[PDB]
Structure formats: C-alpha cells, structure tokens
Symmetry: C3
Subunit: 231 residues, 3 copies
Amino acid sequence: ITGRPEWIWLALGTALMGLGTLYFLVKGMGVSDPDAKKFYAITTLVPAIAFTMYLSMLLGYGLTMVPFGGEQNPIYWARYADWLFTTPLLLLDLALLVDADQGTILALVGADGIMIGTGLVGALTKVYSYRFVWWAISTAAMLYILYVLFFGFTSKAESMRPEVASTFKVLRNVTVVLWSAYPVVWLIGSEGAGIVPLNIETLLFMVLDVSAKVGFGLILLRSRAIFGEAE
Amino acid sequence: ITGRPEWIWLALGTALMGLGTLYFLVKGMGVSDPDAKKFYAITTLVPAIAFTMYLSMLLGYGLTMVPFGGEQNPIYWARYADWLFTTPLLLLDLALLVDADQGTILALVGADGIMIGTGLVGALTKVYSYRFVWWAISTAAMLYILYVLFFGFTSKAESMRPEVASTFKVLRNVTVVLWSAYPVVWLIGSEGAGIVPLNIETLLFMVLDVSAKVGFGLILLRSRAIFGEAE
Amino acid sequence: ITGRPEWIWLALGTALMGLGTLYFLVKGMGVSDPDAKKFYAITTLVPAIAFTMYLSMLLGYGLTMVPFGGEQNPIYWARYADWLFTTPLLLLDLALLVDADQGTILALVGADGIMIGTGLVGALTKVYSYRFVWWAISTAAMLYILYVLFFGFTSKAESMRPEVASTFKVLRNVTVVLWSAYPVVWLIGSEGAGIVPLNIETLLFMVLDVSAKVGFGLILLRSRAIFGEAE
Ligand SMILES: CC(C)CCC[C@@H](C)CCC[C@@H](C)CCC[C@@H](C)CCOC[C@@H](CO)OCC[C@H](C)CCC[C@H](C)CCC[C@H](C)CCCC(C)C
Ligand SMILES: CC(C)CCC[C@@H](C)CCC[C@@H](C)CCC[C@@H](C)CCOC[C@@H](CO)OCC[C@H](C)CCC[C@H](C)CCC[C@H](C)CCCC(C)C
Ligand SMILES: CC(C)CCC[C@@H](C)CCC[C@@H](C)CCC[C@@H](C)CCOC[C@@H](CO)OCC[C@H](C)CCC[C@H](C)CCC[C@H](C)CCCC(C)C
Ligand SMILES: *C/C=C(C)/C=C/C=C(C)/C=C/C1=C(C)CCCC1(C)C
Ligand SMILES: *C/C=C(C)/C=C/C=C(C)/C=C/C1=C(C)CCCC1(C)C
Ligand SMILES: *C/C=C(C)/C=C/C=C(C)/C=C/C1=C(C)CCCC1(C)C
Ligand SMILES: CCCCCCCCCCCCCCC
Ligand SMILES: CCCCCCCCCCCCCCC
Ligand SMILES: CCCCCCCCCCCCCCC
Ligand SMILES: CCCCCCCCCCCCCCC
Ligand SMILES: CCCCCCCCCCCCCCC
Ligand SMILES: CCCCCCCCCCCCCCC
Ligand SMILES: CCCCCCCCCCCCCC
Ligand SMILES: CCCCCCCCCCCCCC
Ligand SMILES: CCCCCCCCCCCCC
Ligand SMILES: CCCCCCCCCCCCC
Ligand SMILES: CCCCCCCCCCCCC
Ligand SMILES: CCCCCCCCCCC
Ligand SMILES: CCCCCCCCCCC
Ligand SMILES: CCCCCCCCCCC
Ligand SMILES: CCCCCCCCCC
Ligand SMILES: CCCCCCCCCC
Ligand SMILES: CCCCCCCCCC
Ligand SMILES: CCCCCCCCC
Ligand SMILES: CCCCCCCCC
Ligand SMILES: CCCCCCCCC
Ligand SMILES: CCCCCCCC
Ligand SMILES: CCCCCCCC
Ligand SMILES: CCCCCCCC
Ligand SMILES: CCCCCCCC
Ligand SMILES: CCCCCCCC
Ligand SMILES: CCCCCCCC
Ligand SMILES: CCCCCCCC
C-alpha cells in the first residue's frame, strides 16, 4: 500500500466515504415519509458505492497499467466503475426533486452513461492522440447534461413549492461547478497531458468526490424539500 | 486504421450513426408533449450509443483476437456492447407504443439480454463446436421475442388508436425482418462457419444496423402516434 | 469437461435449471391477469439466467485461475454474473408481493449489488488476507438486506390480504435460511479457507441455487397471492 505516494489520499477518501455512509444511514433511520425515503435511499447508496471503490484503489485492486507515450502508466480504472453508478444516482436526486418527466430522466441517465463510458475508453486507449478524441466526446455529453439542468429543470423548479425550488437551485449550482472540474483534472493529469503528477491528481479527485457526494448529500438531506407537504 | 480492409464500412457506419443522432437531436428540440419526449429520448440514444461503438471499432479498440480453428480470429466485441443497450431500447419504443404491461416489458428485456449475452459468449468461445451451442440458445431467445411481438402486442395494438396501430404494425414488420438477418450473418461470417469474409460481413452488419436504428427512428418520429390525443 | 471432478454437479445444475425454466414457461402460458404476469416474468427469468451460467461453467468458459497461497486456484467467476442479476430479481418478487415503496426497493437492490460486487472482488483478489476483508463487507450488505426483509416488510405484509401475508412469510423464511448459507460455503470453500474441496463446494452451491430459485418459484407461482382480488 504505502509504496504508492498517493496512498494517503486514497485512505482519506475511503474513511470520509465510509463515515458519510454511516451518518446518512443513521440519520435515515427515523424516516417514514415515502417521499423522504426515496431521497435517503438514493443519497446513502452514493457514498457506499464510492467507499468500496476507494477501498479497491487503496488495496491495489482497482489499478492497472496502460502503455502509452512509451511508458507503463498507472491508471485507476475503479474510478469509472464508481462514477458509472453514482453519477446517475446523483442526477436522479435532482430530477425527482423537480418531478421531472420520464423522457427527460432517460435522456440524462443515457447521456451520463455515454459520458462515463467514453471516459473509460479514453483512459484505457493505447494510442496517445486518440485518448483526447474520447475526452472530447465525453465532454460533449457532459455539456448536454449541464444544458438540461439549466434550460429544462430550472424552469420546472420555479413552478414548484418554494423550498424545493430554492434547494434545487443550490444543488444545481454545486453540481455544475464541481462536475465541470473533473474533465479538467483528467486532461492535465496522468490520464491526459501528464502536467500534474498522479499523487496531486489523486488529491484533487478526492476533494471533488467528497464534496460532490457527501457535501451534496448533507445539503439535500437537511432540506425540507424531501418531505411531502403534510399537516 | 486503413490496414484493415473493413475500415471503409466502419467509417461509413460511424458517419451515418453520428448524422442520425444529430438529426434526431435537432428534430426533438421543439417538442413539449411528455409522451413524445419519451420516444425522442429513447430513439435518439440508440444511434448515439451505436456511434460510439462504431468509432471504437474504427480506431481498433473494440477488436480482439480469439484462437479457434488453429487461427487467431479477429472478433469485434464492441458490437455486443452496442447491442446490449440499443436492442432493449428499441423494444421499449415498441412496447410503449402499444402501452404494454410491465410484466411483458420485463420478459422482453430479459430475453433480449440473454440473446445478446449468449451471443457474446459464443463469439469469445475457443472450442469451435461450442460456439454454435451458444448461437442456438441465443436464437431461441430471439424467437421468443419475435413470438411476443406477434402474438401479444399485435392484438394489443388493434384495441388502440388507429394511428398507433398502423405505425406499430409497420415498425413490427421492419423489426422482425431485420433482426432475423443478424443470426444468419453471424453463422456464415467470421464468428461462425467463415464462409463470408470479414470485410463483407462488416458491410452487412452496417446496412442492418443503420436500417434497424436510423431507418426505424425516421419512421417512428415522423408518426403522429407518439403524441397524445390533444385538441 | 469430465476432466474436472465437479463436472457432475455442474451438469445436474444445468439440467435442473433448464427443466425449471421450461415448467414455469409452460405454466405461465395460460395467464392474463396483469399482476400475475409480473410474477411469472420475474420468476421465469431467474432459472433461465442461471441455466446459461451453469452451462458456461460446465463447458469451462466461466472458470479462471487466480494465484494466491502460492497456487493457481480455480475460481468459477460465472457464479457472480448469475447472482448479479438473479438475486435482485428474487428480491423484487418479495417486494412486489408486499407492495413495498420505491425507496425501499432501491435500497434493497443497491445493497444487493454491493453484496455481489464485493464478493466478486474478494474472489479475484490475489492478496490472501484481503479476500476476507471483501467477504466481511459483502456479509454486512447481506445483513442489511435480511434486516429489511424482517423489520420493514413483515410489518407491511400483515396489513395486506391474508393470502399474500402467509405466502410472503413462507418465502421470507426460505430466503433468509438459504441465502445465509452462501457466505458460509464461500468462507470454508476454495474461495476462502480451503477446508472443503471444490467438488463438494460445487455440490453445495448447486443444492442452494436450485432450492433458492426453482423451489422458491414453485411456492410462489402456486399461490393465489400473485393474482389480484377479482370476482
Ligand atoms: C443507456 C446507457 C446506460 C447507455 C450506456 C452508454 C455506453 C454504451 C457508452 C459506451 C460504453 C462502452 C465503452 C463500455 C466498454 C467497457 C469496457 C471498457 C470493458 C473492458 O474492456 C475493454 C478491453 C480492455 O481494455 O477489453 C478487452 C477485450 C475483452 C475480450 C472484452 C470482452 C468483454 C466486453 C467488454 C463485453 C461488453 C460488456 C459491456 C460493455 C458491459 C457494460 C460496461 C459499462 C462500462 C457500460
Ligand atoms: C435481466 C437481463 C438483463 C439478464 C441478462 C442476461 C445475462 C445473464 C445473459 C448472460 C450474460 C453473461 C454471459 C455475460 C458475460 C460477460 C463476459 C463476456 C465479460 C468478459 O469476460 C469473459 C472472459 C473472457 O472471455 O473473462 C475472463 C475472466 C475474467 C476474470 C472475468 C471476471 C469478470 C466477470 C465478467 C464479472 C461479471 C460481470 C457481469 C457479467 C457484467 C455484465 C456484462 C453484460 C455482458 C451482461
Ligand atoms: C446500484 C447498484 C447496482 C450499485 C452496484 C454496486 C457496485 C458498485 C459494487 C462494486 C462493483 C465492482 C467491484 C465491480 C467490479 C467488476 C470487475 C470485477 C470486472 C473485472 O475486472 C477486474 C479486474 C481483473 O480482476 O480487471 C482488470 C483490469 C481491467 C482493465 C478492468 C477495466 C474494465 C472495468 C471493470 C470497467 C468497469 C465496468 C463496471 C464495473 C461494469 C459493472 C460490473 C458489475 C460486476 C457491477
Ligand atoms: C462522485 C463523482 C462524480 C460526481 C464524478 C463526476 C465525473 C465527471 C463529471 C467526469 C467527467 C469526464 C469528462 C467530462 C471527460 C473526461 C473524463 C471524465 C470521465 C473525467
Ligand atoms: C441495432 C442493432 C440491432 C437491432 C441488433 C440486433 C441483433 C440481433 C437480433 C442478434 C442476434 C444474434 C443471434 C440471434 C444469435 C447469433 C448472435 C447474435 C447476437 C448476432
Ligand atoms: C440464486 C442465487 C442466490 C440466491 C445467491 C445468493 C448469494 C449470496 C446471498 C451470496 C453471498 C455472499 C456473501 C454474503 C459474502 C461472501 C460472498 C457471497 C457473494 C457468496
Ligand atoms: C480544476 C482544478 C485544476 C487546477 C490544478 C492546479 C494544480 C496546481 C498544483 C501544482 C502543480 C504541480 C506541478 C509541479 C509538480
Ligand atoms: C451536523 C452536520 C455534520 C455531520 C457530520 C458529517 C460527517 C461526515 C463527513 C463530512 C465531511 C465532508 C463534508 C463536505 C466538505
Ligand atoms: C441475410 C443475408 C445473408 C446473405 C449473404 C450474401 C453474401 C453474398 C456475398 C458473396 C459471398 C462472398 C464469398 C466469396 C468471397
Ligand atoms: C427528411 C427525412 C430525411 C432526413 C435526413 C436523415 C439523414 C440521416 C441519415 C439517414 C440515412 C439512412 C436512412 C435509412 C436507410
Ligand atoms: C452451510 C453448510 C456448510 C456445511 C459444510 C459441511 C461439509 C461437510 C462435508 C465433509 C467435509 C469434507 C472434508 C474432508 C474432505
Ligand atoms: C407439480 C409440481 C412439480 C412440477 C415439476 C417441477 C420440475 C422442476 C424441477 C424441480 C426440482 C427441484 C425442486 C426443488 C427441490
Ligand atoms: C449503466 C448503468 C446505469 C444504471 C445506473 C443505476 C441508476 C439507474 C437510474 C434509473 C432512473 C430511472 C429511469 C426511469
Ligand atoms: C447491477 C445490476 C442490477 C440490475 C438487476 C436487474 C433487476 C433490476 C430490478 C429493478 C427494480 C426496480 C427499481 C425501481
Ligand atoms: C452549455 C450549457 C451551459 C451550462 C454549462 C456550463 C459549461 C461549463 C464549462 C465546463 C468546461 C469543461 C471543459
Ligand atoms: C415463432 C414466432 C413466429 C415469428 C418469428 C419468425 C421467425 C423468423 C425466423 C428467423 C430465422 C433465424 C435463424
Ligand atoms: C440482523 C438482522 C436479523 C436477521 C438476520 C439473520 C442473521 C443470520 C446470520 C447469517 C450468518 C452469515 C455469516
Ligand atoms: C497528441 C495531441 C494530438 C491532438 C489531438 C486533439 C484532439 C482533440 C479533439 C477535440 C475536437
Ligand atoms: C463443428 C460442428 C459441430 C456441430 C454442432 C452443432 C450444434 C448446433 C446445436 C443446435 C441444436
Ligand atoms: C490470513 C488471515 C488474516 C485474517 C484477516 C481477517 C479479516 C476479517 C475482517 C472481519 C472484520
Ligand atoms: C468507519 C471508519 C472507516 C475507516 C477505514 C478505512 C480507512 C483506511 C485506514 C488504513
Ligand atoms: C458529423 C460527421 C461525423 C463524421 C466523423 C466520423 C467519420 C470518420 C471519418 C474518418
Ligand atoms: C431440457 C434438458 C436440458 C439438459 C441439457 C443440459 C444437461 C447437460 C448434459 C451433458
Ligand atoms: C460543496 C461544499 C459542501 C459544503 C457541505 C456543508 C453543508 C452543511 C449543511
Ligand atoms: C427499413 C428501411 C427504412 C427506410 C427509411 C426511410 C423512412 C423515410 C420516412
Ligand atoms: C426450499 C425447499 C423448497 C421445496 C419445493 C417444493 C415446493 C412444492 C410446492
Ligand atoms: C456516525 C454516527 C452518527 C451519530 C448520530 C448522528 C445524529 C443522528
Ligand atoms: C446561491 C447558492 C450558491 C451555491 C454555489 C456554491 C458553489 C460551490
Ligand atoms: C458555471 C461555473 C463553471 C465553473 C468551472 C470551474 C472549472 C474548474
Ligand atoms: C405493411 C408495411 C410493410 C413493411 C415491411 C418492410 C420490410 C422491409
Ligand atoms: C418474417 C419474414 C422473415 C424474413 C427473414 C429474412 C432473413 C434474411
Ligand atoms: C412457516 C414456514 C416455514 C418455512 C421454513 C422452511 C425452511 C427451509
Ligand atoms: C434464521 C435462521 C438462520 C439459519 C442459518 C443457517 C446457516 C447455515
């Protein structure tokens, strides 16, 4: 484990995702509202999945070597197995908050799968220049997601209860800022141009992951928007 | 790329799926009917997924070598990753058109997963004679799907609006004819008996894919069956 | 095939899953109740999936070698591909029986995916002591599932029709007893401590699989709880 300088950030990430999972699990014990139960189930699964994948990276299972640039490059593939399941769950939290229609939910989840799937292909591609073709396709899929979150959901939240509109607006802004950083870290990190070393890259993804999952969840599950209007 | 004679058909397929995706995306911009939005989302995702997998084959990522018959045989595995997601989406288009019940939808999607999954196992199997055992199981799963589309959905469409009944009947006939060709191309192509060479096999799958996805989508999204009855 | 002593139990399992699939398929022909159709579709898919994965193990495709303990250990990975899809389908049978809320269904299916996913990682892990870390995480996920089936569903079934309450109680008890045996067989078998040899381990999993899928299905599909109350 300790033979890799980035191990400290993988261990911290593992701990923070595990602690986040347990807090949400305990906090959700005393909840019977069927609407609130939906948000607790979605939001608790997110850091639980991330916990297992951070642990796999810490123990060395989620790491492979990819030859490109005449070098064997360490690629943590477990990140994409994490994101494949956690990013659509996070979008479902937002879509259920605004009572989005089914067709829009399917478009979001499908574009998200394309985003993560093409990012994985780009991470494992051995022809250096082709890695950035996949990065560009994946980034186009992300821009579609961000467009929908702004010019489809925002207008839908305003016609909703005030507390669900204000909570959505906050979580929307958090998501757009944090998610946009991921393609940048990829491009300048060891998967892309190799400007930033792997140990610093790992620290950046850990800060982003914890903020986008645990921080996101703390804002959502403390809001009254997750409960139905009741007397 | 150009070192493979089949590259021209992979490049054409990539272009036609990309163009198809963009047309459906633009055409769906001016749509607010929640029913129509469902069909546009399903139908636009189909060629978008196929685009990415054709590109992976063009660039050489979606290709592996499988030893059988005393030879290293080029097997494009990316086809099955495509079909795993696009064939159930196409069946969902048909099932939603006739307002099929949930139990029937699950049976269709499950049989479809078995069809594609066993076809993938057959494509990667190293014992030559066993490849055709998997082909037979996969073909049995397809025949179940075709039976349901005829002796379960057809009777359901007649009790529906006339425009949804006539549109379903057309898309049903297109699907049964085109899908039935796939097991035949597999059997006589490089995955099976090896009668037809890979470059011709690739041309045939490209014609079938574009027809079953883009051609299918053009018929559906030009129909009024996708809109609810409104004044 | 016959070069492996466990082949006899893989062949028996294949036959019993295939026969089970055909019986459920025939029995479900004469069913039009939309509620009953749901249970028949879920319950017939379970042994059909298991059939294909037992066949892959029989023919040698679903087997790999994992080095640990200074030895190349035969690991049947196809079991986890089976369980990944069949265990959530079995939980869906139970959840639909008691009309569970959506949030609870998602929590069950998500915990089940974590259970199977971490068990697969543990089966393929090359550092011997780490294999049991994954076993423990997977077992914690199972205990969560069992808790929900007892202290969330049981109370919900009592407020239901008497026949659905008594049928659920029976299937609940069958599930908790049979599922609990799996982590024990893993721990003492070739994936874990290696006390029980592989051929005996394979026999035990076959008895458990057939009972948990075909036996489970025979109890459910003979009950009147799967039909709506009708005159
Ligand atoms: C509606 C939305 C959900 C739609 C989703 C969008 C999606 C279509 C976007 C594209 C996804 C696609 C790129 C997934 C590729 C997975 C692949 C990286 C797995 C590893 O295989 C890659 C190479 C080794 O580098 O295999 C070496 C050769 C091996 C012999 C490969 C044989 C196994 C194949 C991988 C079998 C295909 C399985 C499916 C891809 C499983 C789904 C994986 C997940 C990442 C989507
Ligand atoms: C309700 C419906 C959706 C049900 C679906 C029906 C489905 C059950 C039908 C059978 C599907 C099954 C054959 C999928 C097999 C995937 C497999 C080809 C992936 C590549 O692995 C094959 C060998 C190399 O040749 O791995 C070499 C050895 C490696 C060490 C393998 C270890 C990884 C395992 C593959 C882990 C299992 C992952 C799941 C199979 C992922 C789903 C893939 C998709 C193709 C279903
Ligand atoms: C809501 C719920 C459904 C959530 C589900 C819970 C889930 C997150 C729990 C953890 C699942 C995770 C451990 C799955 C790992 C699959 C992995 C074993 C496949 C084989 O790859 C392992 C190594 C060889 O030993 O690959 C060698 C290196 C290769 C180069 C690997 C590159 C391919 C990657 C495997 C791509 C990721 C694909 C996804 C993991 C596909 C889903 C598989 C299924 C088992 C979940
Ligand atoms: C909890 C994890 C989250 C919210 C991860 C989000 C990840 C992304 C938005 C990743 C995007 C990428 C691109 C847009 C292209 C480059 C490759 C990716 C996958 C890093
Ligand atoms: C857009 C792609 C489509 C509609 C693909 C359809 C593919 C099939 C219907 C494939 C069927 C197969 C068999 C029936 C057995 C032989 C292997 C397959 C997977 C080619
Ligand atoms: C039809 C198959 C069924 C119902 C299989 C159930 C399997 C389990 C409940 C497996 C549980 C495991 C653990 C709890 C940890 C050890 C590894 C597993 C996956 C065997
Ligand atoms: C979206 C965030 C990207 C900003 C990356 C900042 C990295 C600064 C760290 C110093 C770079 C290390 C280079 C010298 C080793
Ligand atoms: C009462 C609110 C705080 C509860 C404690 C939460 C502990 C989980 C770890 C959170 C750290 C990361 C927060 C986002 C920066
Ligand atoms: C379902 C369509 C299958 C028909 C295949 C027709 C192939 C004819 C092309 C000529 C065969 C090439 C053999 C000589 C190289
Ligand atoms: C107005 C209808 C035609 C629009 C142009 C569609 C261009 C997408 C490519 C379609 C070619 C394949 C059609 C099926 C044979
Ligand atoms: C949950 C069931 C686990 C019980 C396992 C009993 C196995 C007894 C078979 C004899 C053990 C073989 C050891 C000598 C070869
Ligand atoms: C009339 C009920 C029996 C029908 C025959 C079922 C045959 C399928 C194989 C069942 C054997 C396994 C039963 C569970 C132990
Ligand atoms: C490729 C993996 C995608 C599945 C991720 C799991 C979450 C799915 C959310 C589905 C939302 C409901 C759509 C109607
Ligand atoms: C990782 C694979 C999980 C999917 C298994 C297929 C069954 C899914 C059941 C979904 C139940 C409905 C949830 C609302
Ligand atoms: C185009 C939709 C408007 C909202 C999206 C904001 C774009 C942020 C740019 C992200 C940069 C990634 C490289
Ligand atoms: C048996 C259901 C009737 C409709 C299915 C038509 C069968 C077409 C044969 C396909 C040939 C594939 C080898
Ligand atoms: C803790 C929830 C109560 C019901 C679960 C029964 C636990 C059975 C123990 C299984 C042993 C697996 C190692
Ligand atoms: C080795 C660098 C080659 C540059 C390729 C950049 C491709 C980016 C595509 C974005 C449209
Ligand atoms: C090398 C050819 C061996 C023939 C096997 C055919 C199997 C087909 C099974 C269809 C029932
Ligand atoms: C080689 C045996 C090492 C023992 C590790 C046991 C780990 C079990 C963790 C359960 C909390
Ligand atoms: C609940 C605390 C979980 C912390 C265990 C993971 C941290 C790795 C320490 C080496
Ligand atoms: C929108 C046009 C997309 C065409 C790019 C793919 C074709 C491959 C050319 C080499
Ligand atoms: C319907 C009977 C299915 C039996 C075939 C599988 C058994 C393997 C025999 C070698
Ligand atoms: C993106 C930063 C999240 C901050 C988490 C703190 C929330 C406390 C309510
Ligand atoms: C299967 C052939 C499809 C033909 C596509 C043309 C549709 C234009 C309306
Ligand atoms: C767990 C044992 C199941 C027994 C199956 C027999 C059911 C006949 C109704
Ligand atoms: C990490 C355990 C949390 C302790 C309870 C927090 C207040 C519900
Ligand atoms: C109005 C809410 C602002 C939230 C933005 C937070 C950016 C990290
Ligand atoms: C909408 C604000 C985008 C912020 C992008 C930050 C990328 C590091
Ligand atoms: C009555 C519609 C006929 C459609 C059949 C088209 C076959 C390619
Ligand atoms: C229902 C007509 C079937 C046509 C099969 C064509 C196979 C090449
Ligand atoms: C009251 C029903 C008892 C069922 C338990 C069966 C254990 C195999
Ligand atoms: C609730 C009874 C548990 C039985 C466990 C059996 C494990 C072999």
